[model samples]
Target chain A: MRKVIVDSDTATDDTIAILLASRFFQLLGVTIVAGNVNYNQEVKNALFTLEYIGKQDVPVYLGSQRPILGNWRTVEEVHGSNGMSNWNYPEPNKRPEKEHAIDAILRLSKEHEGELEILAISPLTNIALAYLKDPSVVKRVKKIWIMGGAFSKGNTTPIAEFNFWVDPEAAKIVLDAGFDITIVPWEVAEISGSLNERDWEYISKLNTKLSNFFINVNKTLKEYTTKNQGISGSIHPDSLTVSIAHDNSIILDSSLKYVDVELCSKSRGAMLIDWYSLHKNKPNAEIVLKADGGKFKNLLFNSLSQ
Target chain B: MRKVIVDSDTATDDTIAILLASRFFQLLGVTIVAGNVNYNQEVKNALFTLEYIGKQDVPVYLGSQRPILGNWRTVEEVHGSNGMSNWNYPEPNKRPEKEHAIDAILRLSKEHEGELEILAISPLTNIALAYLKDPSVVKRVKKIWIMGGAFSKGNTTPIAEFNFWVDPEAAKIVLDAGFDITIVPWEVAEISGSLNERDWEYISKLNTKLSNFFINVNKTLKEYTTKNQGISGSIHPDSLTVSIAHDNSIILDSSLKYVDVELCSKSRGAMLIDWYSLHKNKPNAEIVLKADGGKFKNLLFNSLSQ
Candidate 1:
């Protein structure tokens, strides 16, 4: 029902989220950034996912290749070299448009005038750069739903989840910009998702093109998951965040907390949720600590079956 | 031996470290703060540890009651209510010196300018405030061997080690103050020293008042360690940091790193270590990742024996 824009780096997880969002909201445009993989490769993946979902009409824009601090930390191991776990889709016939992601975001904010919502599923380099260039655009945007951070179950560092850790400086700048932001952290997804063998078997029986692709492409991440956490499934942090954008019923509860990023500790780039009311700063972000798993699973099934 | 001052929270671990530092360094003076326990109880523990070794001559000065941000989070479960595992000691006949900790630290630094080394084994509140109030005192101090932070193994939260996590704002202020800082993080200390069954058996045979007191006052920490980490020993983090000060050979390896704290994430207060040279900031810290446990054990035994 809301005019939304999806900004991602097109990893295997992002591909699923993109398709999922397409089934619901009126997705205005898709913006790509360099994260789990390179920006160039991520653009191709975005285009191909759109083409598969028959959304080639949706425009795509290119964004920054690195974070605001220009510290390039890639995750080809977690998401694969192409970010799609070697899934073979038809070569995309349509490519990204001439508009830069920062420009698209700025122009859309002006075009929509406080009616646009942002679904951010990657390192926030483009959004940070956009805010740095023009704070008004960010202020005008209705809200940003982010799929990053880890409350307790950190995948990268002890406190750092993947997306924020990829470029913490960018995450910090975006947070300091003081926009209406909602975060669905790694902890909720870790607890909410189906990554076990039983769940994988359930997914195996879905017998759809997207499900088959999801199963095949997610093999490495699944194995990576198994090795690290003794689990089996994509956490689908992005997909979960987008579901909240589509339907509020999927969120169990959310708390308004003063959340910020730690920039100077050795455990750098961790999300500091003011759980104890230790800090005096007012709540800048709403933290969704739990999700209704059945609703999320049903949403995922319907999106894939479509 | 170097002239050194031990700044501590005077928990069971710090009592051991104080005794260890007393054996070698001229033991200029002892300063107490709130950490593993509160400042009130911690100061008594400092006085008792000194009196046990008959060094009440080394004046004890009380430091900050809480962190610079001044949030009180005490670990009485680990350090016990009195910060000494309920081991009854003769009530301290002597009290803290007349001077406040900041003034004493400043005056002492000027007294032994460019030569006084500090072993900081607690939250950096006092030191950070000192630097904030008088940066010259911190600058004149030779170096600080701190028992805070974690490379990747955060004990408090996912990314925060206890001492730094207790007052991340102070840790950041101290880290940013540009002192010659060396970190003996929790990761190294968790493996560096102990008071397990084997260690207790070794200490029990020493037949000294301090060794008997070390064994008795450390029982709760030993049990806490076993319950939390499934390990039989106390981490003895502060003692390990002091061991490094007592003997550089105790450090197996050290690397120069640019360490900063994350101030804005839910995982705020994590240490951001630039191990791969990803960040452009010059190295502000020398991190001791590995410690020679054998030498540390020998030193601990020798100190307790003394």
Candidate 2:
């Protein structure tokens, strides 16, 4: 298994992505932040899910609740009341460690040095905080898989996705930190990448605990697609981000781009992909525009089957 | 159809509850609160969900972003990054009405005077704010079905559930406001009310758009139960609350009690249920202890099948 640290809000899809990472990655620890619901609840959700999958030994660290510059809004509507369908799962026996997520990110990066990958499925708060505290962290870590930003279309607003929109300032900070990064833009998931009814059929037919688990948490988003996007299945941007990270083969098309987050009020979280090097800045990121959805579906199904 | 308005921090289960209400009741409007995620996002979530379900004409009202006395936490971990599994659903085209949730609750109460039911699945902040602004609205309403408080075990803390724990002051205010109230306590869901594997199988077999929608959003909580409670299915406190509200037949046991919230530091959100009238006060709330799971399951299945 590869060594990795996941920074997430740990909601429904985040939890599913976390499980996929847990199966394929060594899974150093999950660093929680204030994005999906709240910082505290995100920590508990991560620990609770890790414990559920018998990954209780994995540590959880707390990070910034607000953004680097100020504050951002959370999308509780998308997740659930508890961020996990408000199922009222019992409190996790495990608690987040005393170390802050920023500190843990730095220490872990140094420990794993040049071999660590940070899977950030929430706002870039913790990662940006880590880089702000010590810019040297940029070179120690290997890569960062970010499930945020919108090159063209947006999710949270007309020009931004939830993670980046929640903390645009943090996104700018991390984008400037110069780490080896892969951007999974929201449009990629919205357009070509999604798990449709066929995928749902297979998963439900599998009837395993994980398959059953997969079906329940994905209900809201499925309806979201049915209503909003006029699609049959749900989009899995976070899951796709993880899949591409775990095995780059799933990535069919990506390009080196000079990317940054717009801080303007109207397009605060909009990803400024220098499609034609308009900014004359060196390419700092590999922006993924297309991925093999069939391979991803198999990867997700096989992982869940385990 | 019965007349009702939902005060929610619209997340996964909250959306399901809202859908149930939209079907079974003459849902006047949804009054958004700030518990599950952020107030603004919660408002958008409710609006987006309603729009998706073709209930776009139903008005959505924004409410308190924080508690009455001070601030409280959100459960992003439980919901997701953008609240619905980070699915990157399109932003809601509809915006919340200018009216505050408190104001809307008050206005709607009088509009359908003595025939309105307030289904509060988030915090009691909006309702409390409405009552604080105009207590007369309480008498104008028929009843309040609140999915909050805890008679025993708590999900948010050792002695509190998410809704009440997020705003104990609001809870106390609502409890003290003389109104016909039914509390579907968190403990009730934990102990006796949950959808098991058999229920899951039945739901999957139903295989309608609603059933598929139900499965996806419920994934996180199902795993949570399997891991935390050693159960194969998930709990449905909010859904059950709606079920009992729509038809009281699902309620197997309930009792009048003098219910109050503890605001002290240690037991800030703990509910103090005077089981034997120890406070020598008149019973202010009907606390649900037991509900018919079979009936609830059937009701849920039938509703989704439609």
Candidate 3:
């Protein structure tokens, strides 16, 4: 089994990502970053989520509390105060391990070398910090897949999606470092992978503890999407990342292109793409241009089924 | 006064550009295109040059003779073909007429809407034909700048520069269009601009036709500095399009962007350029980046005295 490291912020989508990933990957460890909720609450959500799924064996590590450069902005309206609505469980009996997520990443990378695959589904603060502390780990990790940036448009800002916008400097450092990167842009994930009422009905029918969590998360997401986008559906962000990892067939066309994250200016969160064919000399990361919605949804449904 | 159109194959440099546009700009009615050497040559070396000299009197009419989408090589051995070599010439005899150079550009552009710039420097064969056969003169005329492209770096392919590597089918129509155009490229008047060692040494005391040509062209291009560039003496290509038309001071850096010309696979002579920061949403002309040493020397000597 592939040793997968999920660095998430425990939003509704993030919770779904973890559960789905658990089905296929060897859930090596989970690192929590500040995004949909404050770092403390996100940590709580991670532990609570694992317990909700009854996977007490998974260890949750707390990462950076704030963004690499700017003030942190959490989405409380969507994720709720505790990061999960309609599901309240007893507090975890075990506190998070004392080691920071950055430390854990470095330790794991050093220990595993060419074996670790980092799946970053949140602001890239801890990963960037770890790379800065030790540059050699960049070559050691097998690959990094990020669920951020949009080819056509963005979710958070006009030029960037939320996770990348949260810590653009860290994103820039990681992108510029020339790692083997695969980006699941919002353009490919949101419109194509949108979860409709039918998808919600399908997940609700699972009737397991994990199914219950997915239903509640899907309900909250559907309401948000309908109110803002006028679409009666939700785009499960983490599930898109999981689908990308599970199969390459989910994407249609991918190109190796150089991506730079802007960290300053009113457009600080912007991803500057030299889409006009400039920077042909620079090293590039894989940018997914298309995704098959039907196939991806089928994969998600099958993965979540049992 | 005189009605003169500037027909140019833009190259990188600023001296010859200053000489050509300083005094003759008012009578200048329009400018025409030819692939001097590269794609950027027409735009970067010409349009930017016009902007540099602040001469807006001349409306730039783009033209085409060469097919778009190939490598554009230069001729540097004889006349160095770069426009600023040892040749000398009198001031331009006439200003651009009111007619546009597009009648000269059409035949070439119809077949390659987004793919060709008909450059007419040597004989106006390709351009003249383009005007006659091509029905869409207005649309296609907007896309090209022309100069010659060849192999042997500067030899002009055994004996001919790119402009003479003519396709008679399109050249005739482009020139007959009565379109306003600038024809400052080689083969027309550049020969009169060359200055030899004798002219350089006794430039102050000459009364012959050759001596006067040297004096006039040299006087026009004295402000330019050409040193430390792998040449025995100071020289410049027909860079007026860059320095006089486009702002020379704004050139922060340069790149060896790709350029192709239409010749056989053995004779492919299309000039392709990797433009800098060009927008896909907007229409932009080609910009030339390379120039030959001897050609530059001829343009400088002739334009200085002229």
Candidate 4:
């Protein structure tokens, strides 16, 4: 229903987001940033993902190398050494377009001006850089679907997520600049649309090329969750952002508020939602406070299998 | 009496804190940062303040222009055009030592290692920066006394005060890294030591250099408090931070809790005192829950006029 540019760190979940984007909406591009893995490895995962889904027209663009302000904080150990879940998939033969991610963002955004949606599932450094260089980019954006931060208990700290924590200054730049922003917080990622053992039992061993790669590259993540949270399958946190573009019905509840990245704490890079109207600032974004897990899983499953 | 460093933003209230520090404690040094005014202006006020008090040996060090990551959030309009009461006191001729604020923080901390207390009455950017760059700086700190954040109604937001809101990320960094910490929350700042007209009558014309300077710098604050919160005389918000250094008995009641700055929203830099232990983290600091206004006023008036 909408055009999307998947700005991502391109690991296991981001691959799923792209896969969901391809089938549901017209995916225009995939721009990579350093996060779950290095941007270099991220590009490979993105390209291989697009190739697997047979979307040759959707160009990939390289983005920021390190965070705008933070010391490098990546989790290649969780994503595998190459950041592709150890699938050992063949290198992507497709070359990325010549334009830099920021340029591509500006160029494409201008081309589609008020229509294109940016589904960002990464550290957001590139988007922040682009917004600072040209505030016009933000005004033109119809909406930005971000997959980072949490209202409560989070991954990095008790209240922070990994992506925003990786480059909180960048997150602040983007959060302040963006026109229409929607948050799919880190807790929402875990609470909704999980792959249960039964769901994984079929998908992991399914004979399709996509299925094999999905299962292989994500072994480390599987190990990570199993060891830490005792969950048996991977969490496809990024897919919901794309799913929302196709259908908004899956989200059961949401709230409008002034959401901003916390730049000033050990719990830095956490998302703060002003639910009580505690702040004088106008509501700049909407938070997906609740959603249907079964609906999310069904949508994701149908998108990937097809 | 405690050996202390007054890390101040050099506003009217901060001037009161420094004055109280001189009499009650062995004032070691002064560090300046940008909040009520720019760091340069803050240092100027600090120097002029020290000159007025005849403590010319208290070395001053300059710090961040803004917060750790904030882009110059200042309240010169509230403090005055020059970040003072517009006294335009002869531009302080006293030159700051070559030591940077962070280096001074490190050197002094090491010199007094496990004994030096930091009474920070400003945005926490310099302390946060030092902690991040060299964690050893945090280990050497015996305690940090801060005047920021609030448990209830706030000057900035429902839960945030000006000092913490100016740079919540820096506040977080300092909170997480500190060995021992105490907070003079915003409510405590407002609830204690407010001068009524009858109370202000004597002190307004107390006819000393300190009282004259005190009345001059705080007229705007008096106007502000009268117009907004309906108080006749100015509130000495920053004085208790130093008062605690002199005599803990002045604090009628206090509570030890895991106090953290809210870093994730437009209500960014709000204080979340964990009385219920909502977070899994252990206690990090004590918060002044109540204070005696009579005791605080007597201490300030006596310290100044004497």
Candidate 5:
């Protein structure tokens, strides 16, 4: 069994990704940071998701409440005020672990040295902080799968994705930290992992506990995507990343590239990819260009049907 | 005995500071980062300093080789090519501990939680990294005595100090981390810790092993200070900070201020002392303004005389 930690902001897709990871891997913990909605809401969503899946043994650890240099920039409108469509679910009995997210990351990486994998599906603050605090964790981590950035376009701005846009400094640090990273860019999810109306009907009618929970949790994102972005259905960037972690065969196309996040104005949070060896820098990340949508849907359906 | 870690660049005054710390406190370890000279030279100088003082048990841990964002900026002209006045001392038998400086800081902070004091006399990189990685260390640390920044003037640029100038980002992160911090600024050392001709002669005549070591190490800085800066003798910013840590009575006058470091061009790394509550930010650090020169001299003499 592969040991993994899911560092997330615990929004709509992130909650689904956690559910998938909990079923597929020896999920050690869910480390929450501020991104999608309120910081407290992210933590609550994480705890509620774990409890909902009966995986309450996996603890939740708290992380940074804001980006490294900026004030809180949240997308409450996209993920709903509570990050779960303001469902007002009962409070979770479990509280965040006493240990901080960065400490738990360090300790867990050490305990599973060279065998631990990280699924970073949120702003890169916690992952970057772990690297900044101790570079050795990079050596210990076997690999990292990050769900951020955009190869062709962006969702937040014209060229920046939400996760990378939220914390460009952290994205830059994590990209430059020399880890074996695979980037599941927003383009991949928007083009390949999106669920159409028919697919949503299928998942909604599955009627299992998890499938129902997923449909309810993603209601806000789904409506927002169709109304504002003119997409036929909602995208699943975090879930796609998690599915790829569960089974790498889902990744149909990838290329090694020297990737970086722009921290300046206008292009801030925009990911720069050395597509034609422009800068001649060594490849720091594997850019996942395309994934198998059929295989991803199968994995999502199987996990939810369980 | 008080538990402490001396994070140094292992230059002239840093070596003296480490010696004083070893004698007065339970010196846990010496963590080295890039500052006055080459990174390798800094580590070697730290190991050599410990061996020379028969404190070889205190291990040396390597840290960052450059500032958080910039290329390597070294002051070899002031600290010598080897950071010890080009003495070319034989390398010590002990190698740097396998653990990195940031890990050592985090681990030691936890092991001696709420009781550890850190003497950061180098660029603020290591301490800031520790905080960025694990802010809990801030609460665990009893206090931090940092030898960086300038209240009235600068040593590296027109209005910046050397340590803070080298890594202003790290300084900013550290100053804002809410640690129990006391800053021994460059102006304080220049005004209250300088040794004149008579004082230098007295130290040279003391003729103890450690005193001779100190004089030889500071030769490059002493020459540069007198020739370029018109100072009569050498300043002991790092050593004075250490002495104050050993005995706070050496601090004559101080004030609590919301201090910050400039990270922009022109005045980059300049210390911003909110002396008049202009920003209304809570007081984050205690800024040392003056010290009893006689008391500092006595502490230095006694430490070296041993």
Candidate 6:
């Protein structure tokens, strides 16, 4: 089993990311960076979710308070004021791990060498900072799977998706460093594995308490997304990250090519894909261009099943 | 004003570059390529040179018989074959414009779009061909400049400079092309600038031919280089191109950034520099780097006196 570290901010999607990754990989730990929420609440959400899932042994580490090269910003309206929809959950009783996320990442990478797989599901500040501290950490990690970019179009700017746009310079540094990356672009992930009303209805019928929580979460996500963009269903971002992680069969037509993130502009956070011209000589990351939509949906359904 | 055409085989130096470029801001007429020593040779040598001297009127045309990409091998036995040699001589007879060098270059560039500047100073295949077939002979009438890279580290690769290394790749084209380039590579112009013991002694004796070339081409170049790399003398190749056209002061630290060549294991042609790297995101040409000491001496003496 591959050892994994998930650096995230405990937004609703991030909560789902932790839950799914915990299922297949040996979940070494979780590190929180300031993103969909501030650092403190994100750390609390991480710990509370671990307790809720009964995996208290997994440590949570707090990471950078702000982005490496930009001011911190958040989407409270989308994720809710408390970042987890004011679900009167108890505060996480445990203290965050002693080491900062950057240090934790560096130490873990050095200890495990080529065995660690990093899933960056947030704004990428922590991972970017860790790389700046020690560039070799990139070589040490096996692969970095990013849940970012819009292969077709974008949700934020006309040209960029959120995670990449949020901290574009950090993203540029990471991408340019030449890692083995698999970008689950928003164009592919958001549209590919969307759950229909019938699928949500089936998920709501499960007996497990976790199923009850999922149904409520799904409803809130759907309402907000629909009100904002006229989309009627929830596209589980984290689940898509997990689905690709668990099954290689979920992806199709991937190619190894360089991808860069724009660091400055109105399209500041855009993911610049050198799909054709920019990467003639450099080492490339595989970009998943197509997906087995049916297989991906089945994988998500099975994971959410009681 | 001197009307000229240039024929050349590009090599790695800056002196010959300055010489060939001294006379023509618009190089009067046309430019053509030939496979004297290599296919990439003439093309690589000419493109940036025309641009560097601000000779926008010069239009470059490709030519060559034997492809350097093939298995046929040409060695640098005469003229040290590499082209930039330490020697001295007057400019060549049978200037490229005497024949088709003038007519072909003028017609093609003018018939297509703009004014013409012909410059040919090496093997004349492209000029010859252009003279024979290109329509609109009356329209183009650009000057020309030619400077072929040498076979000898000194001259003639023991007997032959790069201008005669291979099948001459249709020197007839260049000879026939209406405009011609001022020839200034290793054998003629660059050789004239060489600073030997006699020239060096005379340079210190009076502020004359030997003196000025010694300072600009020899002393300045050698002093500018870092960590001598065990060599006593250093000369540049492209200086001859520059010196032949405008005043020598035009060469400066360029603000443009992109410059590179394609020297794949399979293709050994001269580098294709993206000179428009700043404006359009690709290099424009190969920036000349070194030169021969003695040849520079002759150029300073001859040009100032002329």
Q: Which candidate tops TM-score?
A: 5
lDDT of 3 by residue, A26-105 (tens): 88789988788767778887887777776778888888888877566777766766677534657876567788888999
Candidate 3: Cα lDDT at B149:
32
When candidate 2 is compared with the true two-chain complex, its DockQ is 0.01
Worst-scoring 10-residue span by lDDT in model 4 chain A: A64-73
Clashing pairs in 5: none
What would the per-residue lDDT of candidate 1 be over residues B118-225, giving only the tens digit for each residue? Answer: 999888887888888888776699999988887544666645778888788888888878899999887788787655678878888998988888887787888788
The best candidate by lDDT is 5
Clashing pairs for predicted structure model 4, backbone only:
A85-A217, A86-A217, A262-B263, A263-B169, A264-B168, A264-B169, A265-B169, A265-B172, A272-B264, A272-B265
Name the runs in model 4 displaced over 4 angstroms. Answer: A1-165, A170-306
iRMS values in order, in angstroms? 7.8, 17.8, 19.3, 7.3, 2.7, 24.7
Docking class of 6: incorrect
Evaluated at residue A64, the lDDT of candidate 5 is: 84
TM-score for all models, in order of appearance: 0.59, 0.50, 0.53, 0.57, 0.85, 0.50
DockQ of 6: 0.01
Which has the better DockQ: candidate 2, or candidate 3?
3
| Residue runs of model 6 more than 4 Å from their true location after superposition | A228-231, A278-283, B1-306
Query: For model 4, how does the per-residue alpha-carbon lDDT over B1-306 read when each residue is reduced to its tens digit?
Result: 568898888877888888888877788888888788766777788888888788888888877665645554666667877767677677666778877677788788889988889998888877876664456777778888888888878787667788888888778777777468888887787878577777667776688888888788787777777787765766777887777657778688888888777766667778887798878888888888888888888887787576
Candidate 2, after superposition: displacement of residue B24 in Å?
Answer: 73
Worst 10 residues of 2 chain A by lDDT: A65-74
User: After TM-score superposition, what is the CA distance of residue B297 in candidate 2 from its true location, in Å?
Assistant: 81
Candidate 5 residues B151-231, lDDT tens each? Answer: 658877899899999988789888898899999998789877788778788888889988899889998888877886585
TM-score of chain B of each: 0.96, 0.94, 0.39, 0.95, 0.97, 0.40
RMSD of each: 11.0, 25.7, 17.8, 11.4, 3.9, 20.4
Sequence-dependent TM-score of model 2? 0.50
Write down the lDDT of every candidate, Cα atoms only: 0.80, 0.80, 0.56, 0.78, 0.87, 0.56
- Evaluated at residue A223, the lDDT of candidate 3 is 72
Error of 5 at B163 (Å): 2.1
